[PDB]
Amino acid sequence: DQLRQEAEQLKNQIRDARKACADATLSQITNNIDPVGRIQMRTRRTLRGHLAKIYAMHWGTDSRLLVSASQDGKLIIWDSYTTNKVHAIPLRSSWVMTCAYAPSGNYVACGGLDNICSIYNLKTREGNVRVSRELAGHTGYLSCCRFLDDNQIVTSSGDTTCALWDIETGQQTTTFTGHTGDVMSLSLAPDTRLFVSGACDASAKLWDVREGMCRQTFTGHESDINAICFFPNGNAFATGSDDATCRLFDLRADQELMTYSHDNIICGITSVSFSKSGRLLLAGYDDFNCNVWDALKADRAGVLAGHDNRVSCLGVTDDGMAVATGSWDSFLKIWN
Amino acid sequence: TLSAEDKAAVERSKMIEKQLQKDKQVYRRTLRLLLLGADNSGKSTIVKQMRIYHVVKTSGIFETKFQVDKVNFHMFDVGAQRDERRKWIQCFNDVTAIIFVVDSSDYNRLQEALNDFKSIWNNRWLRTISVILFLNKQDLLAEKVLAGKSKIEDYFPEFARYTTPEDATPEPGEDPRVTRAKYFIRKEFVDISTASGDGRHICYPHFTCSVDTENARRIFNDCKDIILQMNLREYNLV
């Protein structure tokens, strides 16, 4: 077919261009940097109270309150500075797997196996949690949603499609389609104009919120994409796939930057996040352990061996003060 | 010495902890089941019967709550979800049991059903979940066997060299061929279950029909046995 031949020719041209540009591995140039010291993170205050697995969590702007979603159907706000719980929002659907904190903290969005996204306000005058808005229209389960504005929300569903919704009208402002596999993780750039979405097709696609179309694509992972994070500079991102390897890509170079893998790891990267500087990459693994890798040398900076079950979520504070990681053991641990 | 705001925060945290403990006890009191099956398995009929005997087109989960012998059961059915089930299935790694309904009368699709059952059994996160295999739609299977218009050997050649077990007691009112075919299918499923399951993974094979009104009894007995097994370990009996 003419279309198939044209697609094959374009793919071959792209591969040839990448090979020509990628003359040698990037590790050779970066090796000039001195090795980083041993960053032995230690737990400070373990969090208890959840009755089921923790699947999502996000740090707020104040870097004091963090939302957490548990499969029992509960959203709990945990105070890092005190450990006291501020809000506990039961959900009509038990299998909630996504949750996020708005930049201003006025609204919190969540989703589960149901194709309806529920948004609640934590600053109600009465003081009782209520369903502020219910976004409906998705065909698949909500995988992950990240806030970029108090008026509009970007979410990714299991139907291999991402949708931008306007909280005011409550309708799909625009939809992003093209993924062959289910979208798993999402991440927004600092300008909140471009975002990268990973799926089960082992490919990551970069889209523009205003353009409403696919901008770039990034193959290179061997397996399903489980996590995606943006480098603080905003021009690079890091992904964690089921192949037990992490890859860093540049939106401008359109080529792999660094690869993190080892022979002793045969499990997948459930969570991936970057620090404020981006030098240290933190990844959660199914072996009940968390690993810290050097973004420039891929060296094992430290291993967090304290966890009783699989490590579902991981994130760093906006200021980088501490790292909170959630696991299937219904416990969240803060490390510094 | 602590500020009033701090004290109010501690009191609110204590209240939230008490509410969470009450929710925990309520959650533990009830049992949660996952219902799965093929298109022809007849999940809709079973769930409607359960709802009416033991009491938004984009909805992806249908939860039916029924009570047997004062024991609350919450059965979840997957609705508007893509056929790719490798991802969302992991969320059900804490269910007490999975009731998988298989149409034994659909020979062409019995092997796809067997493959799906094998994949569920061998999943890393589902190895701790017992499976209640319900071979539904036995009336059609019996009618086909009596008519003889369809031969199981076309899809399962081992049926030709299969003999009815002597230890098992066939139903007096059932044709020997029907019993032999049902026992062959059950044997296939049991071998699949036992090939890699032991100590913490059990499969319960039973014969049921969509018109049967005693399925809830079998489910309740299965759950009782599963909780017995779990308590044997949780109470240090081993």
């Epitope: 089960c200 399903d224 045969i266 997948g268 | 893509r82 056929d83 790719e84 490798r86 796809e112």
Partner: nanobody
Amino acid sequence: QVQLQESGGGLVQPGGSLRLSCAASGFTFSNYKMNWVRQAPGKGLEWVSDISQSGASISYTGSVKGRFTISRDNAKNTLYLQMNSLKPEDTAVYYCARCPAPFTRDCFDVTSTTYAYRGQGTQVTV
């Protein structure tokens, strides 16, 4: 890029034999369970056979159990499937499916034309 190219097949009279070669590139062949599936015209996909990562365990569907043979070579990362005594009912498009994750014996490579680790198929007609 995860590329899984299938080669071989064609028109063969009844009672003949065929061998379909499946070539992999971009991933470690030895770390993944390989599956062979078929989709007859006007019908859904049907699973044919699979081979474990090391090749020590092999399974076949009852339709062609003991007739077709599946073998894998890790030196060239290629997978062969030899078919014998073809019949008209075997006319279908055969796909080389990979398992979604490594180090696991459970695979879901029978998805209805949305799987990512399945190739573009070979049309075998009789």
